[PDB]
Design a binder for these strands. Structure first.
Ligand SMILES: [Mg+2]
Ligand SMILES: [Mg+2]
Ligand SMILES: [Mg+2]
Ligand SMILES: [Mg+2]
Ligand SMILES: [Mg+2]
Ligand SMILES: [Mg+2]
Ligand SMILES: [Mg+2]
Ligand SMILES: [Mg+2]
Ligand SMILES: [Mg+2]
Ligand SMILES: [Mg+2]
Ligand SMILES: [Mg+2]
Ligand SMILES: [Mg+2]
Ligand SMILES: [Mg+2]
Ligand SMILES: [Mg+2]
Ligand SMILES: [Mg+2]
Ligand SMILES: [Mg+2]
Ligand SMILES: [Mg+2]
Ligand SMILES: [Mg+2]
Ligand SMILES: [Mg+2]
Ligand SMILES: [Mg+2]
Ligand SMILES: [Mg+2]
Ligand SMILES: [Mg+2]
Ligand SMILES: [Mg+2]
Ligand SMILES: [Mg+2]
Ligand SMILES: [Mg+2]
Ligand SMILES: [Mg+2]
Ligand SMILES: [Mg+2]
Ligand SMILES: [Mg+2]
Ligand SMILES: [Mg+2]
Ligand SMILES: [Mg+2]
Ligand SMILES: [Mg+2]
Ligand SMILES: [Mg+2]
Ligand SMILES: [Mg+2]
Ligand SMILES: [Mg+2]
Ligand SMILES: [Mg+2]
Ligand SMILES: [Mg+2]
Ligand SMILES: [Mg+2]
Ligand SMILES: [Mg+2]
Ligand SMILES: [Mg+2]
Ligand SMILES: [Mg+2]
Ligand SMILES: [Mg+2]
Ligand SMILES: [Zn+2]
Ligand SMILES: [Zn+2]
Lengths: 91, 69, 114, 149, 50
RNA sequence: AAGCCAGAGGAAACUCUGGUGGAGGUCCGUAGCGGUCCUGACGUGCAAAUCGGUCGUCCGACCUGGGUAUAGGGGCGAAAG
RNA sequence: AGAUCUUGGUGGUAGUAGCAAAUAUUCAAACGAGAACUUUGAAGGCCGAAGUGGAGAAGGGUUCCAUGUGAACAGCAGUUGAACAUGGGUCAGUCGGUCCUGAGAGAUGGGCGAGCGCCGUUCCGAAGGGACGGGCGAUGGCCUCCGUUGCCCUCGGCCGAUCGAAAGGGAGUCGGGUUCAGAUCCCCGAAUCCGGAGUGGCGGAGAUGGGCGCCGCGAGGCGUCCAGUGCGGUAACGCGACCGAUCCCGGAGAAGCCGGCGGGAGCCCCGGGGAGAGUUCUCUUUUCUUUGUGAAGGGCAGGGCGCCCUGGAAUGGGUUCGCCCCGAGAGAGGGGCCCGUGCCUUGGAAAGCGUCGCGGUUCCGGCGGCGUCCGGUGAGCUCUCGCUGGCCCUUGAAAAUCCGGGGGAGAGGGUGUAAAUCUCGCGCCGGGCCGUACCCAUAUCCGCAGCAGGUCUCCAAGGUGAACAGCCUCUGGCAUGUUGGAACAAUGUAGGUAAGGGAAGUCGGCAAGCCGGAUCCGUAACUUCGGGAUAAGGAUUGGCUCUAAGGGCUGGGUCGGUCGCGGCCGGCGCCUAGCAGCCGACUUAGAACUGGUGCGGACCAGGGGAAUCCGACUGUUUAAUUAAAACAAAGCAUCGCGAAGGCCCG
């Protein structure tokens, strides 16, 4: 059955640290411990090893990513911008 | 210790220069011929008795033939 | 029951002070001081996590008294690299040299026009 | 340990003798093992490449910027941070850039930098929540944490 | 302790050798003025320097 | 606690139930560490700070050996001079 | 005569306080002048495996062991002693140090400094003194030919001395016996590591085959030419070696904490067979003890594999306690590798042990007989190995040392019973120096002491029980903690009980008392929705006799149509709603009967509720009068700083 109404993964923290702080850390912990689809082998085995380091179990590929997510929206926009500036630079 | 499988190997092991002595042990089930070489003790196990006696007379001379019984 | 004592002056449960129980011909239990568990080599590719096969896993100084055959595999890079990554390197080398030939031929035929 | 940015162990070839040179670049976000990075004046604009700022366009952003032309990277090294190449002037060989603090700095056009943002993301987003977590954080850095007013 | 250095062992050896009573014939010498070894040491009463 | 299985109800979104799982500066409580109260004992003591019962904590900012570093207007201090 | 005068001595107090923390002693005998205390025997107890047991580190330094003494000391005594005196005792290639580096310490260059010096540790250094390679030579000499040596060429960044761990890294010793005191060190027996072999110690490998002319009945020989730095497997990889430098690459060393499973061992438990004891008032085929195989080899189980080959999977399948895995190759079939501490074997029974005897060498590793057997269990406990997970704004040493690979500079011989070479088998020699006794604590250490304090570890039985709890016991140990005897006043210290009332006592329920385990129900306000919560409240609990449920192993044939009372194929038949036999733990639920309603019978073991103040919580704090509301904390906010910098030392 459903075990908690709303705390979910931050039920391990009990009543401590404040409801808003637990809610804030909840989504970060979910993204931290989530398994992402590897973009190299296609398997859903890309998980965080340390902060900023994301390793795939299958193809043994290690990627530099975000602290809590596999990639940050900042870095994604940066990659798109660098591609656009490269294709503008060359002709 | 090393276990010699057949009889010819025990013969040319006993005919070695470093063979100090041989000890013959008569057990209930078998007879053990143990030659004391430099590094190892080589044991040959003979199940019957006539072959053990034949080996006893075919041991080379100039070697201690100590009986353990 | 019979209780045991260390046989050496190292009295702490350190990594070098590991024992196992042994029954002597005198019908008593004693400590035998074990050797550390050795590890097989890891592949020089540094990608696949398994350790190599056909190589005896011992402490590093024990490899000095082993024969040559016990420490390698009869293959190129044998005992240093895994078979899978050796095949990958063979194919990669051949195909990249073929690609070099292709681009050389391509520029040689492209330079035909002033 | 002690920094939030992952490090990238990158192996080059020595151009003058038969040897392999191992470097410890600061990992720009997006790079992966088995990737080829290119360092020099003629390197292309890709994440992880190192090339002088003067050869970069007017809006690119960079990771491990040199404060002086010839030392190793000094600016925008902490995780998630980056600098922006604002402007150039071919005469006097100067490039104006924007630092993570928002300040504007004029540097030589020969200063090298890594393209992209440094990995390690929004590490400061997560609340620490625990004096113990703070203790473990600063134990890997230095003796500064329990701060008496 | 059981583990000790050679210099420590030699120091203790000298202390052991010189911790003994005076010979009986000393008191018969002409103008002795010595009654007993006043430098006797017991292992439990007073401890060595080291 | 998350994650997972099955059954059921729903048009969907999803929901309910029973298991599984074993998180946590989590709870009771040994050893350990500490030292609340009796303002108990003792108070020319066993002791120049100890003892008895009762107690706080007991997977962590945990306890502890050894090796090192910091020396006097200096050190070191989750701070009591 | 004074100075709480200085030093020394002596009184009253006073034969006084006191010799009261941790349950406990008793009987007989011996020695002896002398016995509450010594020794022996018997009995009663305690520690109760987290010990009052067995061993170490630090520290001590001879306290260890034997003999003797009874001066002083052991706060009574002593025939005893950790006292005193006289002697004796510590044996190593394989146990440590020694070697390595760690945090760090610290020379030189340089810099500073009046100066002793101190800053600095790669920084302002001409910082490599080495090298199998090639050449020039001296022939030193068994002048064949390889060993010497000087110089030249080439190559050579540990880029920094050195020190730093008896718990880190670090090759390789085990079994039995032996002393008054030593043993993994001595003796016996089995091994093993490292180093060396120049005149090469023995084998084996390399390596000894084809072609053509001839002779020869064939087989087989002669001459010539050409190979020959091994071989097998599709593969994983295998085989006993398996040429090779400078150089390069890699591995091992070399890695946190926690969880859950599984394998192995040791211990525990159960059923028998022996041997020896115990009980026998009655019963008990009974109760207790004991019932081995080291290292190192070989073989085989067993465990693991993110290793290979065939093949291609949806009606998706496999699979764990959990997971998890698959067209990047599932399931299935067949292989390969690693570990192998388990079993068997050599060691090995000759030793050891248990028993029953026989000789004596005042004190024999004496001699002899018999035995050392068969099984079954498991969420058991402890080690160990493995698999798979979780956590981290924490990612959990380095270096000696050893090895593999890439490359092919070179070396080796002209077909010889051959060469260079060899990580293969056997053989030969050596392993120096230092430590090693004992205590390791209610008596060998520190605390002025034989001081209720302090002081780092290892092993760990039975019952009860959730349990390394408490309580009782076995192995082992001890004598009640620096004295005894006789009484049982007050006051005390520690522990109990108390009719009726139930906080009226007191600053204050201080102290004590109530509650307490488990099972079945049942649980409020409030809330950050996680909690509160064992809320509160209620019922049950023994013994005995049963009843149900929860599993594991094998085998299910229709038969002589025939001869390897047995076997190869087949006419020869329908367990397919699964049976038959055997074996096995604990656990739960229910029922009857039963006791003076007693049953978590000892032990273990929350009193509860309604509020107010403060601090969010967990944490920390005045060692020796304050544990708190104080400090810390996450969170929030502000400030400085782009390195010629901010803050700080000097
Ligand atoms: Mg060590
Ligand atoms: Mg064994
Ligand atoms: Mg503060
Ligand atoms: Mg003392
Ligand atoms: Mg807790
Ligand atoms: Mg608690
Ligand atoms: Mg008091
Ligand atoms: Mg004050
Ligand atoms: Mg006077
Ligand atoms: Mg008195
Ligand atoms: Mg008294
Ligand atoms: Mg008892
Ligand atoms: Mg002890
Ligand atoms: Mg003594
Ligand atoms: Mg006395
Ligand atoms: Mg003495
Ligand atoms: Mg140099
Ligand atoms: Mg050293
Ligand atoms: Mg001894
Ligand atoms: Mg055996
Ligand atoms: Mg398969
Ligand atoms: Mg026997
Ligand atoms: Mg000793
Ligand atoms: Mg004491
Ligand atoms: Mg003192
Ligand atoms: Mg005492
Ligand atoms: Mg008493
Ligand atoms: Mg007494
Ligand atoms: Mg009353
Ligand atoms: Mg009453
Ligand atoms: Mg009142
Ligand atoms: Mg009143
Ligand atoms: Mg009270
Ligand atoms: Mg309440
Ligand atoms: Mg009943
Ligand atoms: Mg508080
Ligand atoms: Mg608050
Ligand atoms: Mg304190
Ligand atoms: Mg205090
Ligand atoms: Mg206090
Ligand atoms: Mg606030
Ligand atoms: Zn992948
Ligand atoms: Zn690989």
């Amino acid at each position: 059955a459903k075990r908690t109404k709303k705390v979910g993964i931050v039920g391990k923290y009990g009543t401590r640290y404040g409801a808003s702080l637990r809610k804030m850390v909840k989504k970060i912990e979910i993204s931290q411990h989530a398994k992402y689809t590897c973009s190299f082998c296609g398997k859903t085995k890309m998980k965080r090893r340390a902060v900023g380091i994301w390793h795939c179990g299958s193809c043994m590929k290690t990627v530099a990513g975000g602290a809590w997510t596999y990639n940050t929206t900042s870095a994604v926009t940066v990659k798109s911008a660098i591609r656009r500036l490269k294709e503008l630079k060359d002709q | 210790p090393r276990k010699i499988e057949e009889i010819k190997d025990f013969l040319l092991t006993a005919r070695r220069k470093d063979a100090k002595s041989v000890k013959i042990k008569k057990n209930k089930d078998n007879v053990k011929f143990k030659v004391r070489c430099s590094r190892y003790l080589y044991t040959l196990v003979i199940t019957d008795k006539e072959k053990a006696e034949k080996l006893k007379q075919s041991l080379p001379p100039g070697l201690a033939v100590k009986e353990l019984k | 029951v019979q209780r045991l004592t260390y046989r050496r002056r190292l009295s702490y449960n350190t990594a070098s002070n590991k024992t196992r129980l042994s029954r002597t011909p005198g019908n008593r239990i004693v400590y035998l001081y074990t050797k550390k568990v050795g590890k097989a080599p890891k592949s020089a590719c540094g990608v696949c996590p398994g350790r190599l096969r056909g190589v005896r896993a011992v402490r590093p100084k024990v490899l000095m008294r082993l024969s040559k055959t016990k420490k390698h595999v009869s293959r190129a890079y044998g005992g240093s690299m895994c078979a899978k990554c050796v095949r990958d390197r063979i194919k990669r080398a051949f195909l990249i040299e073929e690609q070099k030939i292709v681009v050389k031929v391509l520029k040689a035929q492209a330079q035909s026009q002033k | 340990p002690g920094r939030g940015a992952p490090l990238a162990k990158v192996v080059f070839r020595d151009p003058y003798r038969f040897k392999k040179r191992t470097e410890l670049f600061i990992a720009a976000e997006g790079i992966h093992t088995g990737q080829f990075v290119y360092c020099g004046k003629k390197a292309q604009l890709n994440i992880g490449n190192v090339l002088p700022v003067g050869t970069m366009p007017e809006g690119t952003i960079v990771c491990c910027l040199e404060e002086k032309p010839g030392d190793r990277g000094k600016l925008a090294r902490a995780s998630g941070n980056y600098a922006t190449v604002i402007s150039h002037n071919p005469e006097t060989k100067k490039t104006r850039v924007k630092l993570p603090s928002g300040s504007k700095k004029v540097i030589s056009s020969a200063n090298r930098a890594v393209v992209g943002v440094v990995a390690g993301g929004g590490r400061i987003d997560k609340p620490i929540l625990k004096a113990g977590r703070a203790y473990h954080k600063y134990k890997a850095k230095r003796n500064c944490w329990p701060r008496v007013r | 302790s059981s583990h000790k250095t050679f210099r420590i062992k030699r120091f203790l050896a000298k202390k052991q050798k010189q911790n003994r009573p005076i010979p009986q014939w000393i008191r018969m010498k002409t103008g002795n003025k010595i009654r007993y070894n006043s430098k006797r040491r017991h292992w439990r009463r007073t401890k060595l320097g080291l």
